[PDB]
Amino acid sequence: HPNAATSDVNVTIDTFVAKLKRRQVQGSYAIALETLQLLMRFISAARWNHVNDLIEQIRDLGNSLEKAHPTAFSCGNVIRRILAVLRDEVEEDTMSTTVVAEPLISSMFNLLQKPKTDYRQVAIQGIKDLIDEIKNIDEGIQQIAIDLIHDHEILLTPTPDSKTVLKFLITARERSNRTFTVLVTEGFPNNTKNAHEFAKKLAQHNIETLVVPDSAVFALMSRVGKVIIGTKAVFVNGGTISSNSGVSSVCECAREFRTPVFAVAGLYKLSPLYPFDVEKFVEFGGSQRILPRMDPRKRLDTVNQITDYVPPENIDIYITNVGGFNPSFIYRIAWDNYKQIDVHL
Amino acid sequence: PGISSVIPTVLEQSFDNSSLISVKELLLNKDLIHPSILLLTSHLAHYKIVGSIPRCIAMLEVFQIVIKDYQTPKGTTLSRNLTSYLSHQIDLLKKARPLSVTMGNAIRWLKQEISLIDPSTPDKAAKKDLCEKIGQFAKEKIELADQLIIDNASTQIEESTTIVTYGSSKVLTELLLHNAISLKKNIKVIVVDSRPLFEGRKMAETLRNAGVNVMYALITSLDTIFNDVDYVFLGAHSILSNGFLYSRAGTAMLAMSAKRRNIPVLVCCESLKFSQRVQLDSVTFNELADPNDLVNIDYENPVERRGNKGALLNQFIKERKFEKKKLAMENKPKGNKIGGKKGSEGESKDASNEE
Amino acid sequence: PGISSVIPTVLEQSFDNSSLISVKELLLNKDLIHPSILLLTSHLAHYKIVGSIPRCIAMLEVFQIVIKDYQTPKGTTLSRNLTSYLSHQIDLLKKARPLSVTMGNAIRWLKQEISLIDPSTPDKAAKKDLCEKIGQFAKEKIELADQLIIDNASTQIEESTTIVTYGSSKVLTELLLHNAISLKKNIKVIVVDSRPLFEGRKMAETLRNAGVNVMYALITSLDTIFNDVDYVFLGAHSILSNGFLYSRAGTAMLAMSAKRRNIPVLVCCESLKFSQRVQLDSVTFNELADPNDLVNIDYENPVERRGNKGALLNQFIKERKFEKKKLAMENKPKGNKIGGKKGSEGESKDASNEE
């Protein structure tokens, strides 16, 4: 399937691709927004008559998008959600067209046995719903969040790169009777500047900031109380993709010390496919940013990566806009937002 | 007389015990000081190469030089204000950069020597024999020991190798170089660096100066690094009464990682470095330094950019602090290579009373 | 409403997540308060026997009694001030001592019921069917659930069993008794108990009254009986959607020990004990009583003695605090048996949607 049909009917595909490839598009949220807009454009314009064929077309589009860029998960997720939204309505329609029992909301046994309408507006509304969801995660978190941390305790903070995490911290810091001391690891060849910014913000906020060299984690772990990951994406068996560098080692340390690890994210960040590898998903940075020189630097083959993967085991809770979930449980949440056939396009 | 007071930046809250301040730029002092000590202090303070092994050697050399230059006064005997002078030197050293365990040992040895030949002798006969003795001692307990360690290491490698490394351990540099050159094996070297002082970079440079197959990375960049690769090596500074690894910075995390990922670690040690001072934490007594070790914005050392940060005393409520010497977990590093070839660090003080 | 604040004991620098005191000795009570509630409050204030399960039942009974005593007024309708009354009662309960999740659920159900029946139906006929339905609910969501728990236990628990427990959880007591006299087997049942309460002691007494071989245990040495012990149930109170147990006393320690030594720990529960609220440590939401429970020299409960103890403010600063409810862990209590029969606490809220 090529862009042969999508020409003077829809244009912005190419623009999207450009944004993906050269990185003029920045932050998962923005990508998601872009995808939503694309979907809106698709809907306001494309010509149907049928329904299954339309679904197939949409699937193909999704596939194409994936092929254009994989690290953008939000894009995929939103598409999947909208497909799911459509699907339920389609199912409802079919029941009226033809003219049922199940123990709970969905079934395994309904997959074994043999099983024109106004869906477009519903589809439109789905997109709006998605947009609204995207709008605020934090305004559905800080009620399950300004609860866990207490007085005279000590936080450990890797990945000051997810805009959500900072906000979460600051909401907690707001209270005039609650007090905590904050340790912040750097993350060097991908995060330093961000970390510095975060530190500055903390200082501004009138709270006790502590700047840490990425080495010196072990000389302070005796006093450590909590662990917060600044993840970018979330997956099937619980685990997360993170907004780059200096998270994995610290998590491992925490696990060794048995010092609690929390995950703060969102369900637009939530994805309906397994990270069978880290290799196919997590991408690498630029060897140029570490060291100068070039002709002795054909010999100096240096390795540095942007994104970070963490195994399901070290992390314990995923507090959402919906509420507190677990690595064992998050799969069902995903299923509650994207349907069973939508997993594979 | 000297200079005290006027210290840079905020004093934070925790880890408030050790000297970290001071004479960086000189302004009036006492009037009979030999300047070589002062020069050395100046060097050590603004040093980006030294790492446990060479400092003590340098100190020894300086002392030798002093002895050679030493003139016995026409009035009083060979040790009257000499002790005072030595004390002053010590004070200066401490003000500049703390006396390490090796330095303490050296001081002890000096004191012993002072006691050995008590006041009764002239000049060019006593110090003639002293200087030679000390040279011989240096030859014995240091260089030969290092050689022994090297040769132990040589056998320790069997068939096929892929290694990850850290630290400005002169001995380790020697080791790896030896592997590369006069052993001609299939020796792969991966380097880890650190922000407080650039040791990893130096190591890499040294490797290049041989033409080694080198990968290079840092403290965080590790999770991908293991995706075949087996060996891991470290370079400790000192071991206490406890058997704990009281060394420099970025070691412990790496060690932990290695432990987690199946294949163990090995460190190297010297048969003089052990102490009877007892501690089990980083907080007790540490190499603490000025936060100027964290001002530069990546890439190199001399660049100086007006980007986002560049202030400390004007930053209201901000506590920027870093540590240099750590205390690594006891059970984690397996093999230790001292004078008696091989052994478990559960030994701790097995050579301490042996002296 | 009465008297609030103005009470002894300091704010405590260590642990102050919830308030600590209230109304114990009655004076100037409002001329509408039902005596059953008052009596219950009086009981709970200095209660030995009940914990979690029977409390809820008692509350339900009280509510039923209140309903029976209540008739529709000429001015105000059936749903006009009932809700307000309920709220007041809840506030009184809170003031007395914080409550359980089951209780909350019951309250919610009551509220729902209030909404369900329309204010137009015959008043005598309304409460006739109401009290029946409440009774039915009680039977199903407690007695039936208990029966189901028992039956679950039956299939799982082996021929001849040694069972070690902590607390006063009535279900477990019932189960033990069933095993003793109804189905008939050998039962070596060991119970542990702390200083302030005598729950374990009471349970032991009860068992004796039914004729069982019991071992009476304390904190100072648990291990001495394990090092043999084969099957263990803990003091169930409330589960959170994490997969933990907000429960009584040093059960956590016991669980840890069990994990260390051979066997998993297991727990039975009711399919309405579950919450949807969550927490993860013994600091989160503490359940507290007065530090007066440990002033007397032990043996019994009401004694009144002269010796040394009795200083909360008298001497130079003296804080004698404690906890009642603590955090039980996750990886260890693998077993859960409910109204929906089976499952793991790893599956922390797989019945909360099914309801």
CSV table of C-alpha atoms in Angstrom, one decimal, chain A:
chain,number,residue,atom,x,y,z
A,1,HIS,CA,0.0,0.0,0.0
A,2,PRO,CA,1.5,3.4,-1.2
A,3,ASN,CA,0.4,7.1,-1.2
A,4,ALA,CA,-1.3,6.5,-4.6
A,5,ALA,CA,-4.9,7.1,-3.3
A,6,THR,CA,-3.9,9.9,-0.9
A,7,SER,CA,-2.9,12.9,-3.1
A,8,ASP,CA,-5.3,15.8,-3.7
A,9,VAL,CA,-7.6,14.2,-1.1
A,10,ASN,CA,-5.1,14.4,1.8
A,11,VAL,CA,-1.7,16.1,1.7
A,12,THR,CA,-0.3,16.4,5.2
A,13,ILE,CA,1.1,12.8,5.3
A,14,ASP,CA,4.3,14.0,3.8
A,15,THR,CA,4.6,16.9,6.3
A,16,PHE,CA,4.1,14.4,9.1
A,17,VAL,CA,6.8,12.2,7.7
A,18,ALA,CA,9.2,15.2,7.5
A,19,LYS,CA,8.5,16.2,11.1
A,20,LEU,CA,9.2,12.6,12.2
A,21,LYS,CA,12.5,12.1,10.3
A,22,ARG,CA,14.4,15.4,10.8
A,23,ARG,CA,12.9,16.0,14.3
A,24,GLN,CA,11.1,19.3,13.9
A,25,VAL,CA,8.5,17.5,16.0
A,26,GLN,CA,9.4,17.5,19.7
A,27,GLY,CA,7.8,15.8,22.8
A,28,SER,CA,5.3,12.8,22.7
A,29,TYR,CA,2.4,15.1,23.5
A,30,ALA,CA,3.0,17.2,20.4
A,31,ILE,CA,3.3,14.1,18.2
A,32,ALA,CA,-0.1,12.9,19.6
A,33,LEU,CA,-1.6,16.3,18.8
A,34,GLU,CA,-0.3,16.1,15.3
A,35,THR,CA,-1.7,12.6,14.9
A,36,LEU,CA,-5.1,13.7,16.1
A,37,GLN,CA,-5.1,16.6,13.7
A,38,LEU,CA,-4.2,14.2,10.8
A,39,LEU,CA,-7.1,11.9,11.8
A,40,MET,CA,-9.5,14.9,11.9
A,41,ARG,CA,-8.3,15.8,8.4
A,42,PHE,CA,-8.9,12.2,7.2
A,43,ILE,CA,-12.3,12.2,8.6
A,44,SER,CA,-13.6,15.6,7.4
A,45,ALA,CA,-12.6,14.7,3.8
A,46,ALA,CA,-12.3,10.9,2.9
A,47,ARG,CA,-15.1,9.0,1.0
A,48,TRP,CA,-16.6,5.8,2.3
A,49,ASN,CA,-19.9,4.1,1.2
A,50,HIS,CA,-18.7,0.9,3.1
A,51,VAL,CA,-17.3,0.3,6.6
A,52,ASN,CA,-15.0,-2.7,6.7
A,53,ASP,CA,-13.0,-1.3,3.7
A,54,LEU,CA,-12.7,2.1,5.6
A,55,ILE,CA,-11.4,0.2,8.6
A,56,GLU,CA,-8.9,-1.6,6.4
A,57,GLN,CA,-7.8,1.7,4.9
A,58,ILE,CA,-7.3,3.2,8.4
A,59,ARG,CA,-5.2,0.1,9.4
A,60,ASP,CA,-3.1,0.5,6.3
A,61,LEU,CA,-2.5,4.2,7.1
A,62,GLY,CA,-1.5,3.3,10.7
A,63,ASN,CA,0.9,0.7,9.3
A,64,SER,CA,2.4,3.3,7.0
A,65,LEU,CA,2.8,5.8,9.9
A,66,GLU,CA,4.6,3.1,11.9
A,67,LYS,CA,6.9,2.3,9.0
A,68,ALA,CA,7.7,6.1,8.7
A,69,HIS,CA,8.6,6.2,12.4
A,70,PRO,CA,8.6,3.7,15.3
A,71,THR,CA,9.9,5.7,18.4
A,72,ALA,CA,6.8,7.9,18.2
A,73,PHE,CA,4.4,5.6,20.2
A,74,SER,CA,1.9,8.3,21.1
A,75,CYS,CA,0.9,8.7,17.4
A,76,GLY,CA,0.3,5.0,17.2
A,77,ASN,CA,-1.6,4.8,20.4
A,78,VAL,CA,-4.0,7.6,19.6
A,79,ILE,CA,-4.8,6.0,16.2
A,80,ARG,CA,-5.4,2.7,18.0
A,81,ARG,CA,-7.8,4.4,20.5
A,82,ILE,CA,-9.7,6.0,17.7
A,83,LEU,CA,-10.0,2.6,15.9
A,84,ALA,CA,-11.3,1.1,19.1
A,85,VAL,CA,-13.9,3.9,19.5
A,86,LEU,CA,-15.0,3.3,15.9
A,87,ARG,CA,-15.1,-0.5,16.4
A,88,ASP,CA,-17.6,-0.5,19.4
A,89,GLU,CA,-20.0,1.7,17.5
A,90,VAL,CA,-19.7,-0.5,14.4
A,91,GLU,CA,-20.4,-3.6,16.6
A,92,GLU,CA,-23.5,-1.8,18.0
A,93,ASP,CA,-24.7,-0.9,14.5
A,94,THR,CA,-24.3,-4.5,13.3
A,95,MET,CA,-26.7,-5.6,16.0
A,96,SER,CA,-29.4,-3.3,14.8
A,97,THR,CA,-28.7,-4.1,11.1
A,98,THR,CA,-29.2,-7.8,11.8
A,99,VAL,CA,-32.5,-7.1,13.5
A,100,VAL,CA,-26.4,-11.8,23.1
A,101,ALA,CA,-24.8,-12.9,26.4
A,102,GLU,CA,-21.5,-12.5,28.2
A,103,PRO,CA,-20.4,-13.0,31.9
A,104,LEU,CA,-18.4,-9.8,32.0
A,105,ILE,CA,-17.4,-6.9,29.6
A,106,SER,CA,-15.4,-9.0,27.1
A,107,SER,CA,-15.1,-12.7,26.2
A,108,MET,CA,-12.6,-15.4,25.1
A,109,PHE,CA,-15.5,-17.8,24.1
A,110,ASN,CA,-17.1,-15.2,21.8
A,111,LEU,CA,-14.0,-15.6,19.5
A,112,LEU,CA,-14.5,-19.4,19.1
A,113,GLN,CA,-18.3,-19.6,18.2
A,114,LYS,CA,-19.7,-18.2,15.0
A,115,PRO,CA,-20.9,-14.5,15.5
A,116,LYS,CA,-25.9,3.1,6.3
A,117,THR,CA,-25.6,4.7,9.8
A,118,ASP,CA,-24.2,7.9,11.5
A,119,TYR,CA,-20.8,6.6,12.7
A,120,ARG,CA,-18.8,9.5,11.3
A,121,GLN,CA,-20.0,11.9,14.0
A,122,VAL,CA,-19.2,9.3,16.7
A,123,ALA,CA,-15.7,9.0,15.2
A,124,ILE,CA,-15.3,12.8,15.3
A,125,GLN,CA,-16.4,12.8,18.9
A,126,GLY,CA,-13.8,10.1,19.7
A,127,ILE,CA,-11.0,12.3,18.5
A,128,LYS,CA,-12.3,15.2,20.7
A,129,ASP,CA,-12.4,12.8,23.7
A,130,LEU,CA,-8.8,11.8,23.0
A,131,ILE,CA,-7.8,15.4,22.8
A,132,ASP,CA,-9.5,16.2,26.1
A,133,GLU,CA,-7.7,13.2,27.7
A,134,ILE,CA,-4.4,14.4,26.4
A,135,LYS,CA,-5.1,18.0,27.8
A,136,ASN,CA,-4.6,17.0,31.4
A,137,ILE,CA,-3.0,14.0,33.1
A,138,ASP,CA,-1.7,15.9,36.1
A,139,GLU,CA,-5.1,17.1,37.1
A,140,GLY,CA,-6.1,13.5,37.6
A,141,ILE,CA,-2.8,12.4,39.4
A,142,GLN,CA,-2.0,14.8,42.3
A,143,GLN,CA,-4.9,13.2,44.3
A,144,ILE,CA,-3.1,9.8,44.2
A,145,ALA,CA,0.3,11.5,44.3
A,146,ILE,CA,0.4,14.2,47.2
A,147,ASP,CA,-0.2,11.1,49.5
A,148,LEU,CA,2.8,8.8,49.1
A,149,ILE,CA,5.7,11.1,50.2
A,150,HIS,CA,6.0,12.5,53.8
A,151,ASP,CA,7.9,14.7,56.2
A,152,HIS,CA,11.7,14.4,56.8
A,153,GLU,CA,11.9,11.8,53.9
A,154,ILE,CA,14.3,11.9,51.0
A,155,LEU,CA,13.5,11.6,47.2
A,156,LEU,CA,15.8,10.4,44.4
A,157,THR,CA,15.1,11.8,41.0
A,158,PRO,CA,16.4,10.5,37.6
A,159,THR,CA,14.9,11.7,34.2
A,160,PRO,CA,13.9,15.3,34.7
A,161,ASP,CA,12.8,15.2,31.0
A,162,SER,CA,9.1,14.3,31.2
A,163,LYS,CA,7.2,17.6,31.7
A,164,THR,CA,4.7,15.7,33.9
A,165,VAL,CA,7.2,14.6,36.5
A,166,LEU,CA,8.3,18.1,37.3
A,167,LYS,CA,4.7,19.3,37.7
A,168,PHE,CA,3.9,16.3,40.0
A,169,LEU,CA,6.9,17.2,42.1
A,170,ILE,CA,6.0,20.9,42.3
A,171,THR,CA,2.3,20.1,43.3
A,172,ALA,CA,3.7,18.0,46.2
A,173,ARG,CA,6.2,20.8,47.1
A,174,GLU,CA,3.3,23.4,47.2
A,175,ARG,CA,2.1,22.3,50.7
A,176,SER,CA,3.3,24.5,53.6
A,177,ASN,CA,3.4,21.7,56.2
A,178,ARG,CA,5.0,19.0,54.1
A,179,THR,CA,8.9,18.8,53.8
A,180,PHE,CA,11.3,16.7,51.7
A,181,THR,CA,15.0,16.8,50.5
A,182,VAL,CA,15.6,16.2,46.8
A,183,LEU,CA,18.6,14.3,45.2
A,184,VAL,CA,19.0,14.8,41.5
A,185,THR,CA,21.2,12.7,39.2
A,186,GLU,CA,22.6,14.3,36.1
A,187,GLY,CA,22.4,12.0,33.1
A,188,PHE,CA,25.3,13.2,31.0
A,189,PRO,CA,25.4,12.8,27.2
A,190,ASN,CA,21.7,13.3,26.7
A,191,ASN,CA,20.2,15.0,29.8
A,192,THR,CA,22.6,17.4,31.6
A,193,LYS,CA,21.1,20.7,30.4
A,194,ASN,CA,17.5,19.4,31.3
A,195,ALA,CA,18.7,18.3,34.7
A,196,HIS,CA,20.3,21.7,35.3
A,197,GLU,CA,17.0,23.4,34.3
A,198,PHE,CA,15.1,21.2,36.7
A,199,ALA,CA,17.5,22.0,39.5
A,200,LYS,CA,17.1,25.8,38.8
A,201,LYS,CA,13.3,25.4,38.9
A,202,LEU,CA,13.5,23.6,42.2
A,203,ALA,CA,15.7,26.4,43.6
A,204,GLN,CA,13.1,28.9,42.4
A,205,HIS,CA,10.3,27.0,44.0
A,206,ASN,CA,11.9,27.6,47.5
A,207,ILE,CA,13.0,24.0,48.2
A,208,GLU,CA,16.2,22.1,49.2
A,209,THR,CA,17.8,21.0,45.9
A,210,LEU,CA,20.8,18.6,45.7
A,211,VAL,CA,22.9,18.4,42.6
A,212,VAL,CA,24.5,15.0,42.1
A,213,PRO,CA,27.3,13.7,39.8
A,214,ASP,CA,26.1,10.5,38.1
A,215,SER,CA,28.9,8.6,39.9
A,216,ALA,CA,28.0,9.6,43.5
A,217,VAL,CA,24.7,7.8,43.9
A,218,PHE,CA,26.2,5.1,46.2
A,219,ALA,CA,27.6,7.5,48.8
A,220,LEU,CA,24.1,8.7,49.7
A,221,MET,CA,21.8,5.6,49.3
A,222,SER,CA,21.6,4.9,53.0
A,223,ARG,CA,19.3,8.0,53.4
A,224,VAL,CA,17.3,7.3,50.2
A,225,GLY,CA,13.5,6.9,50.4
A,226,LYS,CA,11.8,7.0,46.9
A,227,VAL,CA,12.4,6.4,43.2
A,228,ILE,CA,10.7,8.3,40.3
A,229,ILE,CA,11.1,7.4,36.6
A,230,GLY,CA,10.6,10.1,33.9
A,231,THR,CA,9.1,7.6,31.3
A,232,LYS,CA,8.0,8.5,27.8
A,233,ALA,CA,6.1,5.3,26.8
A,234,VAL,CA,4.5,2.3,28.6
A,235,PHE,CA,3.9,-1.3,27.3
A,236,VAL,CA,2.2,-4.7,27.6
A,237,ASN,CA,3.9,-6.6,30.5
A,238,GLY,CA,4.1,-3.4,32.6
A,239,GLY,CA,7.4,-1.8,31.6
A,240,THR,CA,8.3,1.6,30.2
A,241,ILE,CA,10.3,3.4,27.6
A,242,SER,CA,11.9,6.5,29.1
A,243,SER,CA,12.9,10.0,28.0
A,244,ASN,CA,16.6,9.3,27.8
A,245,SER,CA,19.6,8.4,29.9
A,246,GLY,CA,20.6,7.8,33.5
A,247,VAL,CA,17.6,5.8,34.8
A,248,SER,CA,18.4,2.2,34.5
A,249,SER,CA,21.5,2.0,36.8
A,250,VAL,CA,19.8,4.0,39.4
A,251,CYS,CA,16.7,1.8,39.2
A,252,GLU,CA,18.9,-1.3,39.6
A,253,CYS,CA,20.5,0.3,42.7
A,254,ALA,CA,17.1,1.0,44.2
A,255,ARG,CA,16.1,-2.6,43.6
A,256,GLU,CA,19.2,-3.8,45.3
A,257,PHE,CA,18.6,-1.4,48.2
A,258,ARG,CA,14.9,-2.3,48.1
A,259,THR,CA,13.9,1.4,48.0
A,260,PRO,CA,10.4,2.0,46.4
A,261,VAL,CA,10.2,2.7,42.6
A,262,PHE,CA,7.2,4.7,41.3
A,263,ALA,CA,6.1,5.4,37.7
A,264,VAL,CA,4.4,8.7,36.6
A,265,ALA,CA,3.1,8.8,33.0
A,266,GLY,CA,-0.3,8.7,31.2
A,267,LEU,CA,-2.6,6.4,29.1
A,268,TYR,CA,-1.9,8.2,25.8
A,269,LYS,CA,1.6,7.1,26.6
A,270,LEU,CA,0.2,3.6,27.1
A,271,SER,CA,0.9,1.2,24.1
A,272,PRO,CA,-0.8,-2.0,22.8
A,273,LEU,CA,2.2,-4.0,21.7
A,274,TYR,CA,5.0,-5.9,23.4
A,275,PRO,CA,8.6,-4.6,23.6
A,276,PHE,CA,10.0,-8.0,22.6
A,277,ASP,CA,13.3,-6.2,22.2
A,278,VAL,CA,15.0,-3.0,23.5
A,279,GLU,CA,17.1,-3.0,20.3
A,280,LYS,CA,14.2,-2.5,17.7
A,281,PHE,CA,12.7,0.3,19.9
A,282,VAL,CA,15.3,2.3,21.9
A,283,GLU,CA,17.5,4.5,19.6
A,284,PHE,CA,21.0,5.9,19.9
A,285,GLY,CA,22.3,9.5,19.9
A,286,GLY,CA,25.4,11.1,18.4
A,287,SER,CA,29.0,10.1,19.0
A,288,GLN,CA,30.0,13.7,18.1
A,289,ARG,CA,28.6,15.2,21.4
A,290,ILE,CA,31.1,13.3,23.6
A,291,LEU,CA,34.5,14.2,22.1
A,292,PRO,CA,36.2,16.5,19.5
A,293,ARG,CA,38.6,15.4,16.7
A,294,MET,CA,37.8,13.2,13.7
A,295,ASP,CA,40.9,11.5,12.1
A,296,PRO,CA,42.0,10.0,15.4
A,297,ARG,CA,38.2,9.6,16.0
A,298,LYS,CA,37.8,6.9,13.4
A,299,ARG,CA,39.7,4.8,16.0
A,300,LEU,CA,37.7,6.3,18.9
A,301,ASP,CA,34.5,4.3,18.1
A,302,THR,CA,32.3,5.6,21.0
A,303,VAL,CA,28.9,4.3,22.1
A,304,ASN,CA,26.1,6.6,23.5
A,305,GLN,CA,22.3,6.2,23.5
A,306,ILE,CA,19.3,8.5,23.9
A,307,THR,CA,16.3,6.4,25.2
A,308,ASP,CA,16.3,3.9,28.1
A,309,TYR,CA,14.4,0.7,28.7
A,310,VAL,CA,13.6,-0.7,32.1
A,311,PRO,CA,12.4,-4.3,32.9
A,312,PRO,CA,8.9,-4.8,34.4
A,313,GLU,CA,10.4,-6.1,37.7
A,314,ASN,CA,12.0,-3.0,39.3
A,315,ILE,CA,8.9,-0.8,39.1
A,316,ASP,CA,5.8,-1.3,41.3
A,317,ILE,CA,3.1,1.3,40.7
A,318,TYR,CA,1.8,3.3,37.7
A,319,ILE,CA,-0.4,6.2,39.1
A,320,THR,CA,-2.6,7.6,36.2
A,321,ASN,CA,-5.3,10.1,35.5
A,322,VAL,CA,-7.6,7.2,36.2
A,323,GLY,CA,-5.7,6.2,39.3
A,324,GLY,CA,-3.1,3.8,40.9
A,325,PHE,CA,-2.4,0.7,38.8
A,326,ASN,CA,0.3,-2.0,38.9
A,327,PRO,CA,2.8,-3.6,36.3
A,328,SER,CA,0.7,-6.8,36.6
A,329,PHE,CA,-2.6,-5.0,35.9
A,330,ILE,CA,-1.8,-2.3,33.3
A,331,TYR,CA,-2.5,-4.7,30.4
A,332,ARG,CA,-6.2,-4.6,31.1
A,333,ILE,CA,-6.2,-0.8,31.1
A,334,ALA,CA,-4.7,-0.9,27.6
A,335,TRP,CA,-7.4,-3.4,26.5
A,336,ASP,CA,-10.1,-1.0,28.0
A,337,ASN,CA,-8.9,1.6,25.4
A,338,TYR,CA,-7.9,-0.4,22.3
A,339,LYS,CA,-9.7,-3.5,20.9
A,340,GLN,CA,-8.5,-7.1,20.3
A,341,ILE,CA,-8.0,-7.1,16.4
A,342,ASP,CA,-6.5,-3.6,16.5
A,343,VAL,CA,-3.2,-4.9,18.0
A,344,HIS,CA,-1.9,-6.1,14.6
A,345,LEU,CA,-2.3,-3.8,11.5
